[PDB]
Amino acid sequence: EMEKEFEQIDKSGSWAAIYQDIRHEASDFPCRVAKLPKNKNRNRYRDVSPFDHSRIKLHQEDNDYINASLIKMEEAQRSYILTQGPLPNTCGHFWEMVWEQKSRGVVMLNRVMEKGSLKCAQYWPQKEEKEMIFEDTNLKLTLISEDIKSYYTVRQLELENLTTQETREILHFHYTTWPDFGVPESPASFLNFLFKVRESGSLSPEHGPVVVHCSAGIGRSGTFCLADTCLLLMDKRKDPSSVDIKKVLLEMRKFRMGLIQTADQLRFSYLAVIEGAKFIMGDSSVQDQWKELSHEDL
């Protein structure tokens, strides 16, 4: 019936209003640690901070801060860690979190340079022979291989705890065609990407929460996590009718502020979910159609 509401809202162009209702009702919690003078240079955006109750703490004794939130979806049984695009001084902190939280995958939904502006540090190696060493957190990162597609790239990295010489394989999923404050070209390409992450096991419970990020870790990241959670709930009981997307987004906003930044991203979330439902309900051949429609082939 979410599709009914879609026709309704669309029919009466009330997405801006619907979206504003969610903002008026969104949770609001203190972000004291994020605002401490010492963590000023650890935040990319003044207006984007993690709540204290759900922030990820680095296991270091010096300063345990990092702009990241653990979005823990109870009913859905899935957790994601949303974070901002790392800054030049926080890449070490970024991989420390990945290691400490035991994440297997990292989903980047933005590009390093957007609209002629640096939206994220180049926190992973681009060439196999030039690995990166993060002196502050004592970690080493090596590009092992990368599969480049038309609008997204999947990299295989090796992360090594230089202190224990223990190594882990990290899968890096990079969506390169999602405009800042924009929406995927189509839900086909989006779902194709999402399912690719799902195929990798990165979202399994046997692994730490997958780390999701865009430039701030709220706009495009929210859109991604919302569609995934909604499709998962729908899957648990095979009942599209029992999935209240607006209510799910509100449940997510209790863990991090401003998930989904525009009324169009919200509208897209609906589209993505509705289309994704086709696969969840027994039509496994739609996944191939998405792959085709996406045109991932160079």
Ligand X SMILES: COC(=O)c1c(O)cccc1OC/C=C/c1cccc(-c2onc(C(=O)O)c2CO)c1
DSSP 143: E
The reply to whether 66 sits in an annotated binding site is no
| Catalytic annotation, pick one of 31, 91, 120, 214 | 214
The reply to whether 200 sits in an annotated binding site is no
Tell me phi and psi for residue 112, to 5 degrees: -60, -45
Going by C-alpha positions, the residue among 32, 41, 18, 29 that lies closest to residue 93 is 41
According to the binding rule CB under 6 A, does residue 86 interact with ligand X?
no
Which positions from 90 through 149 interact with ligand X, judged by CB under 6 A? 110
Rounded CA gap, 169 and 127, in Å?
Answer: 17
Q: Which of 78, 155, 172, 220 binds ligand X (CB under 6 A)?
A: 220
The reply to whether 14 sits in an annotated binding site is no
Q: Is the CB of residue 177 less than 8 Å from the CB of residue 189?
A: yes
Of 79 and 223, nearer to ligand X (C-beta) is 223
Joined together, the tokens standing for residue 279 give 């696969």
Joined together, the tokens standing for residue 1 give 């019936």
225 is catalytic: no
Of 34 and 139, nearer to ligand X (C-beta) is 34
Q: What value does the CA radius of gyration of the chain take, rounded to a whole number of Å?
A: 19
3-state helix, strand, coil in the chain (%, to 5): 40, 20, 45
Q: Is the CB of residue 66 less than 8 Å from the CB of residue 58?
A: yes
The reply to whether 214 sits in an annotated binding site is yes
Smallest separation, CB 277 to ligand X (Å): 25
> Binding string, 266-295, against ligand X, x = CB under 6 A?
------------------------------
Q: Which of 180, 235, 244, 264 binds ligand X (CB under 6 A)?
A: 180
Strand pairing class (117-118; 132-134): unpaired
The reply to whether 216 sits in an annotated binding site is yes
> Binding string, 44-73, against ligand X, x = CB under 6 A?
-x-xx-------------------------
* Residue whose C-beta lies closest to ligand X: 219
Which parts of 26-110 fold into alpha helices (H)?
32-35, 91-101
Contact positions vs ligand X (CB under 6 A): 23, 26, 45, 47-48, 110, 180, 214-216, 218-220, 257-258, 261
Known binding site for substrate: residues?
Answer: 180, 214-220, 261
Catalytic residues: 214
